[PDB]
Design a protein around this ligand. Structure first.
Ligand SMILES: Cc1cc(CCCCCCCOc2ccc(C3=N[C@@H](C)CO3)cc2)on1
Ligand SMILES: Cc1cc(CCCCCCCOc2ccc(C3=N[C@@H](C)CO3)cc2)on1
Lengths: 40, 255, 236, 273, 273, 59, 40, 40, 59, 57
């Protein structure tokens, strides 16, 4: 129950439960498959 | 013609027969089983030597005399040197096991005496010094010899006072732990099956003992007239469902 | 703004109240439970396991020997032991039953008292155990004893005898702590015929005695035990 | 539920009262196996003996003390009680300890209540109003050195601010590393020849730090902190024999030497009533 | 509901007003059996005479007192009122006692309110703020010896901490051992020739212990505790004659010697108005 | 957090008010009731039994 | 609404609205009718 | 009604109403019947 | 007026609690979000990127 | 959720543990690519590492 009118006044947000490290761990242009050779 | 009385336990390449048993206790009514995945944490596949480790090792014999106070063995310590069980033990980082314990003591229908055979999960001993003196490692790792409660206090060792279970509780209440009596007039063996009991799924076999087996004379031994005043007590123990994990170099432990 | 009124008791801390509180560690994930044999749910589960009674209390320092009730060969008509039934005191007090009863103020129910015989197998004996319900004195001779709850025990192959002290009471609860009004009786044991040892044998034989509660049992109104105290906080 | 059924005379070959205790069992014998009984009902459930109930009331687990005074020229705040600190534990005081050690492994959430009262043992014009700040300093995180260190910023560490005379209350989930807390541990932290034995090595919970936020007034004020702990959501495994001798140390089983006989000696015979 | 029905002249052989009181009955005679009446309605239910209502308001049952002072060199805390204690009872004060003893057996839950106020009879700079801690010490559990014993840990015994000037309130279920509390008991605890007679032996409820949690300030502070008791969920059996003479003791029926005539003497004749 | 306002009378103790309170003895089980003849429910029940009047008050 | 778990913690009980004086006013073994003679 | 998000913050648990002493009172491997002989 | 009772902990400030508060700036409209590459949701996302270890610590 | 799957001996032409870090990627290698593993579950969600939680006290 929100007792207040504005959105800033609500409690903390709830877990992204998004999670996708590939923008950080695999930003390569041509896709690399694990097990296939790195450099062909 | 089956009696509660006669029994055979075959485990590995070794068999025990008793013709004067008094049933058998299975701690907390649970039988040893391997470690389920749902309970697993370490990602390593474990090693299950099976029949080469799950057989019966008979420790060296003790001698019950009228002055005996009782003996105490720790597991897996007592077996630290038995065959391949022991090797596996020093060579893996983690291991887990249940046991069948069979304590033997026969006499005649003229003797009297009664031993308590009890298994205590997590038996943390007390220092006889009091205060917060610790009990050094070696002292709580007697190996197959076990601890002799009628031996003298030593320094860095535990207290050996029987009315207090080596920890500040009374002998009389040890009966809350899985146990069985050997009453010469009834019984000649005691058998207890111990499931693996810990707060972690698998642990180190050398830095932590998870049960102490204790044999304590309670009604003093009384032999017939001009009989030799003593009887030997033998303890045979078999690891069951043993699993080892995290193999490597081979632990080096104090002393 | 909703109008409220606060009542007497606001701000008090009652150690026994049960309410919600903010978690200091928001979102933390506890370690998974694994299976461990032995879970206890009720103290009533454990007081049904029997434990030994130091009945032979006559020593002067605690010894393994006060658990042993001695028996003499060839005595006739005589008395083996006696005790009142104040389960929160005296012999009972250090037993697991005694020890738990002391966490509660009131108890009601039946008790199970058993004796396991340890004499040579070629000996024999007949004992009588008697429960004397509140209102009479501890019996002074078997004749007196045998007129109340009793069991003739014949020592045989079957080593133990289980006597029950059935709940005999006006009032439905008794205090654990020794109350008169609330008192429960006496328990005595006498030779029915007598212990007989085989040839080549000699001396005293002993009985071990246990106590546990019947499934009948009720304990209520928790309190603090006289069995533990301290003078300064402990440290590591 | 019947507490006793009706039962009459018996003359059988079936004797429920003869057993063999050597087996390790406690055979479930009842009054009706050996006397003639009448029906009676239980009228009772055993509610108040549930382990949740047994361990579920607040117990005092710790009393400490800190003072508000001018720290000017104090070389060791910790030592002046300018801010004490406590090594969270649940066995320093014994009433609750004996209760927990009836079990080998125990698992529960904790609810803490902290009462703080002030004392002014020497001449003051008044009673000031102090705010206490208790911090949770788990192991690995900077521990406070002065009563007003950067530590007290507590940007990542839960802290509660309440007023002396009031009470603070919050609840912490079960923070154990394993599946349960060990009430006992017959092990070492490693196979060292001189390492300590016991659980001391296992309940590495860390400590909790208290301080007054207020600067000093002209008089000195003693604030004494009492921490209460209530177990909620209790789970207990493997019952053990109750503690008989007195305790000497946090975390070891050791009892004092030349202790006194714990079993009361009879005033009379074995035969005495 | 009619309070009176309409009734007119009568000339009968059926006389409801002649009875025989020797029988022990009180025949239900009404105005309309002997005069001519008109209809009237009751307009009333008898709500406020229900026993739940009669015994259901808070009554003061006990006033005690404790003080906060330096215990240094006190050989007997109990004796210095460093912590008093009360033997829970419900007859020490008489207004409520006469009300309860209108019945023989009574069964109810109790709601306690405890008011604590402080006094500073001799020169103080200020009024300190003290927290009281009242413990329930049922019979069989260690009773406090000093004002700061292990007892006060109260790990298994319900205790409430509130501030002087405030009030504490909680409710205790019916703790009697039997089905009802005996307001009277014509018995003994056993057939002893010298044992005490009465109920003293039956309402073995135990005592309740109060103390201040605060250490001492420079002045002394008197705290006076008033316990109020309200019966809720009342059940009462067997009415008795009301108390006529004054009371002398908790738990005995005894009245004082050379007491005064309790029936008011007429100022005049039997014939007087 | 829901916004509240406290009214006059907050914190007072009125010996005649009737509200809920925490039980000090959580989970305790009272003794069963047995039957006892004579239960009274209203004081109006008993004032209908007649009793003797010391009319001759002149002593 | 009870906020508490135990029954002792609830407020006062509610009126018996039972009321039967005859156990006290007419405990006679043979029933007496008003108007009929007391002793026959 | 829970007012708080985490489970630790809820009140006490509710009675096991589990109760099974046999793991403690009868941990024997071959079942013993009351009335039948203990040792056959 | 609805009857209330306050519990232990009233008035405390726990830096880790999560509740509602009045907004000081009623009705204010925040700047629109635009898209920015790189959003992080969990610290678990970033500790999977490898970084160099100063293994040769001997300086 | 599985934290580790069961995996046994390998004698392949497909080597997941040889990579080229010069590319800037951190290849998602697991215990089961280089030792024999057993199944285990995560039992965990990563709740308390959410940035809302990290900056939210
Ligand atoms: C502000 C603020 C302060 C805190 C403290 C957080 C609580 C951390 C303590 C965790 C629980 O600690 C223990 C310690 C020991 C035991 C235990 N020892 C054995 C005898 C049994 O249980 C259990 C919990 O959180 N926020
Ligand atoms: C903190 C804290 C303090 C307490 C006290 C618990 C209440 C226990 C008292 C139980 C009720 O006591 C009595 C005593 C006497 C009578 C009684 N005597 C007769 C005249 C009639 O009733 C009834 C109840 O609980 N928590």
């Amino acid at each position: 129950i929100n007792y207040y009118k504005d959105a800033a006044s609500t409690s903390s947000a709830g877990q992204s439960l998004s999670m996708d490290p590939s923008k950080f761990t695999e930003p390569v242009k041509d896709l690399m498959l694990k097990g296939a050779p790195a450099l062909n | 013609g089956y009696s509660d009385r006669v029994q055979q336990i075959t485990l590995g390449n070794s068999t025990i027969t008793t013709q004067e048993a008094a049933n058998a206790v299975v701690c907390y009514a649970e039988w040893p089983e391997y470690l389920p995945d749902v309970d697993a944490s370490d990602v390593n596949k474990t090693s299950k030597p099976d029949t080469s480790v799950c057989r019966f090792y008979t420790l060296d014999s003790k001698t019950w005399t009228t002055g005996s106070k009782g003996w105490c063995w720790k597991l897996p310590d007592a077996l630290k040197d038995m065959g391949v069980f022991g090797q596996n033990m020093f060579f893996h980082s983690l291991g887990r096991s249940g046991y069948t314990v069979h304590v033997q003591c026969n006499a005649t229908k003229f003797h009297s005496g009664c031993l308590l055979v009890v298994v205590i999960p997590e038996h943390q001993l007390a220092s006889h010094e009091g205060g917060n003196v610790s009990v050094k490692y070696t002292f709580t790792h007697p190996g197959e010899r076990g601890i002799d409660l009628s031996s003298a206090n030593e320094v860095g060792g535990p207290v050996k006072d029987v009315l207090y279970n080596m920890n500040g509780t009374l002998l009389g209440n040890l009966l809350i732990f899985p146990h069985q009596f050997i009453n010469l007039r009834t019984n000649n063996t005691a058998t207890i099956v111990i499931p693996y009991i810990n707060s972690v799924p698998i642990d180190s076999m050398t830095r932590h003992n998870n049960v102490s087996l204790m044999v304590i004379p309670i009604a003093p031994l009384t032999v017939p007239t001009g009989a030799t005043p003593s009887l030997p007590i033998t303890v045979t123990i078999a690891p069951m469902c043993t699993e080892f994990s995290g193999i490597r170099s081979k632990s080096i432990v104090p002393q | 703004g909703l109008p409220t009124t606060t009542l007497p008791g606001s701000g008090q801390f009652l150690t026994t109240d049960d309410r919600q509180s903010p978690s200091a560690l928001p979102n933390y994930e506890p370690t998974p439970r694994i299976h461990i044999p032995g879970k206890v749910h009720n103290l009533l589960e454990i007081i049904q396991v029997d434990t030994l009674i130091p009945m032979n209390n006559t020593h002067t320092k605690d010894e393994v020997n006060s658990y042993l009730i001695p028996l003499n060969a060839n005595r006739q008509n005589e008395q083996v032991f006696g005790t009142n039934l104040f389960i929160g005191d005296g012999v009972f007090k250090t037993t697991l039953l005694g020890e738990i009863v002391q966490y509660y103020t009131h108890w009601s129910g039946s008790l199970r008292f058993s004796l396991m015989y340890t004499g040579p197998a070629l000996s024999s004996a007949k004992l009588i155990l008697a429960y004397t319900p509140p209102g009479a004195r501890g019996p002074q001779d078997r004749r007196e004893a045998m007129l109340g709850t009793h069991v003739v025990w014949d020592i045989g192959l079957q080593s133990t005898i289980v006597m029950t002290i059935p709940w005999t009471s006006g009032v439905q609860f008794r205090y654990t702590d020794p109350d008169t009004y609330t008192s429960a009786g006496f328990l005595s044991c006498w030779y029915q015929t007598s212990l007989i040892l085989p040839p080549e044998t000699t001396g005293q034989v002993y009985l071990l005695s246990f106590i546990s509660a019947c499934p009948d049992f009720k304990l209520r109104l928790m309190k603090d035990t006289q069995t533990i105290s301290q003078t300064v906080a402990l440290t590591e | 539920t019947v507490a006793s059924i009706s039962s009459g005379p018996k003359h059988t070959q079936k004797v429920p009262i003869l057993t063999a205790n050597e087996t390790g069992a406690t055979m479930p014998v009842l009054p009706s196996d050996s006397i003639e009984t009448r029906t009676t009902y239980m009228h009772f459930n055993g509610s108040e003996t549930d382990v949740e109930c047994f361990l579920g009331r607040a117990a005092c687990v710790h009393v400490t003390e800190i003072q508000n005074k001018d720290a000017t020229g104090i070389d060791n705040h910790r030592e002046a009680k300018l801010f004490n600190d406590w090594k969270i534990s649940l066995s320093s005081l014994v009433q609750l300890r004996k209760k927990l050690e009836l079990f080998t492994y125990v698992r529960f959430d904790s609810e803490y209540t902290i009462l703080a009262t002030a004392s002014q043992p020497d001449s003051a014009n008044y009673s000031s109003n102090l705010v206490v700040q208790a911090m949770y300093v788990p192991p690995g995180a900077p521990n406070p050195k002065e009563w007003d260190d950067y530590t007290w910023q507590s940007a990542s560490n839960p802290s509660v601010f309440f007023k002396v005379g009031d009470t603070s209350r919050f609840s912490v989930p079960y923070v154990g590393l394993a599946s349960a807390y060990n009430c006992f541990y017959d092990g070492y932290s490693h196979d060292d020849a001189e390492t300590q034995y016991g659980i001391t090595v296992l309940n590495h919970m860390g400590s909790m730090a208290f301080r007054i936020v207020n600067e000093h007034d002209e008089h000195k004020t003693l604030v004494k902190i009492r921490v209460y702990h209530r177990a909620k959501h209790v789970e207990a495994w493997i019952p053990r024999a109750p503690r008989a001798l007195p305790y000497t140390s946090i975390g070891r089983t050791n009892y004092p030497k030349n202790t006194e006989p714990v079993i009361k000696k009879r005033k009379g015979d074995i035969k005495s009533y």
